[PDB]
Amino acid sequence: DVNTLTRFVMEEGRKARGTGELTQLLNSLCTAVKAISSAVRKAGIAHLYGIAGKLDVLSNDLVMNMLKSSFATCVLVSEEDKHAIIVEPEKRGKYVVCFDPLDGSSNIDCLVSVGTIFGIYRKKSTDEPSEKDALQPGRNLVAAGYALYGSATMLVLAMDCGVNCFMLDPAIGEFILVDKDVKIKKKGKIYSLNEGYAKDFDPAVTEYIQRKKFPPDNSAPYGARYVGSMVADVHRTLVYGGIFLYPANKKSPNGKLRLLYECNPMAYVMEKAGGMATTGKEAVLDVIPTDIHQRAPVILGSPDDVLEFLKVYEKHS
Amino acid sequence: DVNTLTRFVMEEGRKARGTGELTQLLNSLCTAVKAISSAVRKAGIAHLYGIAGKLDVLSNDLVMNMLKSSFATCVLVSEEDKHAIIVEPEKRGKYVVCFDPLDGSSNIDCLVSVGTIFGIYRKKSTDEPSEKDALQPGRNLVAAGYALYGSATMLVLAMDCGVNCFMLDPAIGEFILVDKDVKIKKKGKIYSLNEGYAKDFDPAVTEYIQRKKFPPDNSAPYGARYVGSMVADVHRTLVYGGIFLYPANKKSPNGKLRLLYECNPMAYVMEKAGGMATTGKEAVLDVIPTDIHQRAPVILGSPDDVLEFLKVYEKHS
Amino acid sequence: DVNTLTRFVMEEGRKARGTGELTQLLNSLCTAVKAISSAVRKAGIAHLYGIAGVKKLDVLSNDLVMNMLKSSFATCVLVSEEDKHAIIVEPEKRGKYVVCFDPLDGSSNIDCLVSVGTIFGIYRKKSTDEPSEKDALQPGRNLVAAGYALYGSATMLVLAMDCGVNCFMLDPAIGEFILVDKDVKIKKKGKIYSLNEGYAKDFDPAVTEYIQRKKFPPDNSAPYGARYVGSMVADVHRTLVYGGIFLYPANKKSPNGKLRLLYECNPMAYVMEKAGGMATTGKEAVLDVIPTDIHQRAPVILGSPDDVLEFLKVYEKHS
Amino acid sequence: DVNTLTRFVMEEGRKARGTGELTQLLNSLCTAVKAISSAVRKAGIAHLYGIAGKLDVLSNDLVMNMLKSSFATCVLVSEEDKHAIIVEPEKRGKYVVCFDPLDGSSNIDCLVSVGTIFGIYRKKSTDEPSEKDALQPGRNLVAAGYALYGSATMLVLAMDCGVNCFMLDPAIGEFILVDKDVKIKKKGKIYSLNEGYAKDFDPAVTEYIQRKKFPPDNSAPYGARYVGSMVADVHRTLVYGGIFLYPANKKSPNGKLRLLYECNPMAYVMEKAGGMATTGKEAVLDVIPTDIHQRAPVILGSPDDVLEFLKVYEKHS
Ligand SMILES: COc1ccc(S(=O)(=O)NC(=O)Nc2ncc(Br)s2)cc1CC(C)C
Ligand SMILES: COc1ccc(S(=O)(=O)NC(=O)Nc2ncc(Br)s2)cc1CC(C)C
């Protein structure tokens, strides 16, 4: 029996007998994704080239306006905005949203995969809303996931029950449930990182990657893939299994990916799909942030693979 | 002044006072590309999931039927077919087409970019048409290029005058010229190959890669990218500069990519854009093929970079 | 601030503190409307013509609404112009609402690309019996909501409920219905009459006179304009936008008219009244007719209040 | 075998061994139709209503810009512009185009069918082009037709060979040939006119209309339809047979429809499909215009039905 994103959310929202504020947020966000996807596929570009005589910025304004107008949000953190946005009081609701509205948008001249990442928190403090409400640890996530604008446009939603994937049919503007309660492979055969920083790698990364190119039990070497747009690399990891690594180098001693709206949402999706996500020292979701644009090193993916790396990490102290 | 692929080809076709058979072929191919794009973006997928109670095969049939019915082709070589297809005589025309109808479609489960690669030859003899007509070297190409099914749909077309890029506007089904006469950077900063099989690297490849991660002059190391879908990795190389390598080792002395419908059209686009493409021993376009599904190693991209690789390659011989 | 149909329905659903079953109904219906529009615009017809070497549009439309409603968990009885007997939803998918619909009205003339539409009416199941066709035999007064999708130059969804009539434009780049006309109200008097004057030979005498009074005013004012698309959804919606009167009246060859009460006349009458208009059979208001069979017909004259009145004067003038 | 509008125009154009200037015209015109369809279906209206915080005028600018840039036009007459536009010398070509880019658009608030009507004449003089070049009779048409934006978008193209109908598949932006070499019914069962102006009907019109409601041979009365958009009413007449009448009354002794870009193109389709079009006094195509915006009464459709009208017209003088 067929199921849609809006219909899955409403069925789940009634089963839990909640108020609907979260559904309204999800519906508003889903609508922005459909608009962003329309622009990413360059629909309507002919008028820009004078047929009748800022893609990351447009994405940002789409998500800002659609979330502000859902009456369901109070603090919004975006990669595009230096400070958190504090929703004006008349439109204020109970939720905090952190998002990268167009991840990979720097490599968009090459039509690389791009994506939207989002994380949803229930405001915890009872103070007047401020940036501090967006500083919760990943454990506190109520919902998170991403839209991948690839060969097709897909939405991955992870909440308490698990992870579900919806394929956007652009013919009707509706998201079709195509993968119910997805689970990552226990062990993959692919490693994913930018090996250009090999000169700046921590030795454990060097040992684990060396173990993938020349396996010690003389098994088959892993394949390498690295798109360089995080949604694309993480999503492949989810669908095919394996391990993704953006560790700390010298240009980024605290890692390069942003914790609030890049690492934690992927870490939540991974964990709710049976995978693991670590900074090296601790699980990603346990990190308590202090700044909205702070970075974190991240290694995530299949349980056996992330565990194997963790053994290598302890070996080097 | 606004310009489309259909309008552009007619302009070049009149300026050259040709018969129109080539323009008819390109228009048919472009229409097949738009039809492929709609399915890759999963338009109408709602009906496959029972809303009222094969993707590379469909691609192959679209190009085949659109080429056969253009009245401009006589022999068609496709990745999907063991033997070359001979157009029935009533629909027979003066051109030979080699294509991969959907390259990278094996990784399409994760929505990575996919593409169609095509190369066009003029039939040289007046014999009865046979596979012998497909075995020209890349030097003989009249037009060649690819469609990238990425974040957007782009058609890159390389003919004698040079390389031009068209963006598909899906609201109107027209390819909008957005890049006239592209030329690749003289030297790039990205290396692109599957470093997972380092255990089996030919030694020159090993050394070339180490020099990219660890420059002896302590200049900047290159970044690594590898989508693992050929159209995507090559198009990025064209847009950003750099080098793509699917090289020969000893386990596969001829590489893995197919010469007729993968290596030659990319070599043509690269060379027509100021780039280089070698197998290590010779330019890709100089190879005289003996079997339509034969393999060839390929290293392509910026001239300074292909030259540097070849400098390392002669060293290990 | 921008507004979409899905967002508008949820707002009203919370404001009224309902269970959500009705919102789930309209959203599923909205989705079926979007899919119909995709097919009506012949998206993918190139594959139908062997571009790589399935049903008829009104059959497929019916399947879409049926399947989208059955799976909404908000319906128990479905009556369709396409199905002779009312459908009783299986118990697991069973809900508390009864739906009458015309899935593709006017589809007979679609070979000429005339406007076509989906019409729907939504009732609450009143009795506590096991659900049966009888639950569909409620009068139009009992409607919870009603409206129609018009697949014309654009695809517009008109939703009429107690609070009023709202119009949504389908933006196909994103597949969302955009609130574009809030709280619509029909003109008190129009300048258009709409009916099939080819069958004048069989006109009820009041109609013959009323049309003469619109073409040759006794008060020697300006004549009314004539328009008749012949697709009910198109003609009624124009009357809503420009004012005037629409007539599919009763003659002697068809003393009860030809249009169907449950899923054509009642939903159009419901929209008309919630927008300040009128809909009468001549003898009684359309919404007051108590149906005895799900496919029974009824004459309908609707449009601006003043114009339906002038007709009623002439109708009662003819005893 | 599948065939598109562009491929069909190229085939007939090659068979005639022409320069391509007409094919270039039609391709550019077809692309503007595709753009108007997208806007008329209100694609992208969500941004018009502030999702991130003029339709006939847009229609004209599209056709104007698309025709000027085809390098195939010299004089353009449009319903929207009081004087003919004279294409600038660098973009000049050998064809004259009269069009209504968005006919019936005054009724677009109710989502009535609208259309684009066009007629194409060869430049008459070799002098400096001027309005006199558009003042040719309908007999001189090289090609003419219309795009109907109704429940679907269809292109009706009438040239010397006949009339062919193309359906726009908006999923791929190509017009698909769906009716070859169409011919109108010899006699229909529908008449189509505005009986609201009955007060001023020419007596012949009154008598012919009475003859349709009350047949002397006690056959079936004709059915009545009148959408009020000429393209919609004319296309129905072509597809189902019957008669469309916008005749001369006392309120308008020369009719109200415009002869160059409404009556002349529709009469041509009618004649090329086996139908007829008269003003009452003469064939529409034989009227030589004196001013580009002159009006003409028109009665068109199936031949036997127009003949029955013409008998009554000759009877009444
Ligand atoms: C466990 O999942 C949930 C729990 C609560 C909520 S909620 O607080 O928004 N409640 C509601 O929406 N109630 C409703 N009433 C009428 C309607 Br129709 S929906 C939503 C979800 C779904 C999300 C996770 C996709
Ligand atoms: C140098 O470029 C070309 C040379 C020949 C050809 S052709 O053989 O197809 N001739 C024609 O098309 N003639 C026409 N006359 C009128 C029309 Br309208 S088209 C096409 C191209 C363009 C391609 C390569 C982009």
Ligand SMILES: COc1ccc(S(=O)(=O)NC(=O)Nc2ncc(Br)s2)cc1CC(C)C
């Ligand atoms: C006044 O109109 C209504 C009355 C009841 C209903 S309802 O029974 O469906 N309740 C709900 O939907 N509750 C919800 N809870 C959470 C969410 Br989020 S929506 C809906 C409407 C809206 C109109 C447009 C149909």
Ligand SMILES: COc1ccc(S(=O)(=O)NC(=O)Nc2ncc(Br)s2)cc1CC(C)C
């Ligand atoms: C009567 O049919 C025609 C007569 C002349 C012309 S034309 O002057 O445009 N010639 C050409 O286009 N030649 C070409 N050369 C290369 C190509 Br590829 S097409 C076109 C048509 C067909 C149209 C009207 C559908």
